[PDB]
Amino acid sequence: AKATTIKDAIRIFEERKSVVATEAEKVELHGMIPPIEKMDATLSTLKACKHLALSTNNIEKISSLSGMENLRILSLGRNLIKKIENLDAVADTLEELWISYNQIASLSGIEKLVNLRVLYMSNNKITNWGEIDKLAALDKLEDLLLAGNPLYNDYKENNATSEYRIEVVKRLPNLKKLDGMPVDVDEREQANVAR
Amino acid sequence: AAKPALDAALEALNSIKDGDIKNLKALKKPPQIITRIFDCVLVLRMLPVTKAEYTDEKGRMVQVGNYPEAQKMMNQMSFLQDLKDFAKEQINDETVELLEPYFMSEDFTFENAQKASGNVAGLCNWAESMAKYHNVAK
Ligand code: NA
Numbered sequence: 233a234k235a236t237t238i239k240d241a242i243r244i245f246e247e248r249k250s251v252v253a254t255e256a257e258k259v260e261l262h263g264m265i266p267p268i269e270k271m272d273a274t275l276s277t278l279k280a281c282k283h284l285a286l287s288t289n290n291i292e293k294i295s296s297l298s299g300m301e302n303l304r305i306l307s308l309g310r311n312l313i314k315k316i317e318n319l320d321a322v323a324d325t326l327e328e329l330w331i332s333y334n335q336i337a338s339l340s341g342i343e344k345l346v347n348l349r350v351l352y353m354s355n356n357k358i359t360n361w362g363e364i365d366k367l368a369a370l371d372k373l374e375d376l377l378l379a380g381n382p383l384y385n386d387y388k389e390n391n392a393t394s395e396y397r398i399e400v401v402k403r404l405p406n407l408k409k410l411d412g413m414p415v416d417v418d419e420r421e422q423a424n425v426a427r
Numbered sequence: 428a429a430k431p432a433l434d435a436a437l438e439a440l441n442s443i444k445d446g447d448i449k450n451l452k453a454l455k456k457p458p459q460i461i462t463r464i465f466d467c468v469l470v471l472r473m474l475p476v477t478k479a480e481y482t483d484e485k486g487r488m489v490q491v492g493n494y495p496e497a498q499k500m501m502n503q504m505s506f507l508q509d510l511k512d513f514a515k516e517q518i519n520d521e522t523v524e525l526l527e528p529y530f531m532s533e534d535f536t537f538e539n540a541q542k543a544s545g546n547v548a549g550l551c552n553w554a555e556s557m558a559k560y561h562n563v564a565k
Contacts, residue, residue, distance in 0.1 A: 263528030265488045267479045287521070288479045288528045309521055310479055330521035333476065352521045354473045377519070379473045412517030 235290070236264040238274040255280050262307070263288040271296040283307065287330070297321045309333050309352070316341040323347070332356070332377065339366040348373055355380035364403050374408040376400070384411075402426045429563035433515070436556035439549040440510055447546045448501055458543035459484045462492020463529055467554035468510070469496055470525050471518065479528075489532050510553065518561040526558050 241261040242253045267290035276299030283305040291311040298321040310333040328350035337357035358381040387396035401423035481488040540548035
């Protein structure tokens with residue numbers, strides 16, 4: 233009753249869904265009781281997985297994604313993760329990273345996810361625009377969520393969310409959706425003059 | 428379009444009166460299940476919830492709710508209208524996945540929550556209906 237291993241979480245998933253986890257396209261390991269604390273090499277058996285659900289656990293470090301040859305959506309929201317790292321093994325295929333409600337303050341390492349289209353990271357610990365500049369390397373990034381980070385809250389509490397959206401699009405000119413709302417043509421134009 | 432889910436969401440909010448929120452504030456300690464109900468509202472609104480963490484409630488392990496953040500939400504006089512105004516079309520897939528652990532608990536039902544706290548238990552139906560709306564609308 234301290235921590236659930238990946239192996240044990242897979243058995244719970246297979247009992248709830250009646251699919252062999254090695255065959256499954258969506259592997260649901262979220263919300264284990266007790267929480268998962270460590271990713272491990274059992275994840276390498278999940279060769280068919282396109283959507284790995286590991287949200288609502290107590291994972292502290294990203295690791296052990298080697299062997300997930302089809303992984304397209306990596307869901308790690310509501311864990312204890314501080315650093316974006318150890319993602320080279322899925323960089324060729326990963327299109328969405330869902331990692332809201334973690335403890336990420338630096339986006340160093342996000343640049344490896346060259347095919348990323350969607351990044352959800354509400355309620356993390358981003359405090360400065362220098363972190364958002366690191367996202368400009370992602371040529372396919374279309375959908376971004378920053379609500380609840382200190383940097384977002386700074387602007388929200390001063391009734392300046394419009395200024396915050398311009399700061400984002402200034403750095404990410406091709407972004408299509410921000411915090412669930414489309415980037416409109418007037419926001420792009422203001423961002424173009426600000427840039 | 429998912430009008431049965433949206434109809435249930437609106438019935439849920441219309442079942443809650445301002446006096447219900449007042450009386451809930453008057454409790455020194457809320458029933459544990461109501462803190463999880465409000466966590467579902469916090470998740471949909473992208474407000475703070477605490478780490479995954481469990482406590483024994485009537486013989487089952489259930490998530491510890493972030494009730495102080497729920498109180499902050501309830502201390503805004505616009506709270507109920509804010510839920511009526513909620514932009515359902517902006518729910519994303521991650522938010523639905525973060526709700527599912529609450530719905531996984533055998534005791535997380537309107538009947539059980541209503542027995543504990545009355546009309547405010549409608550927020551359980553509101554949260555489940557928003558998730559149902561999102562899953563249908565795509
Ligand atoms: Na009440």
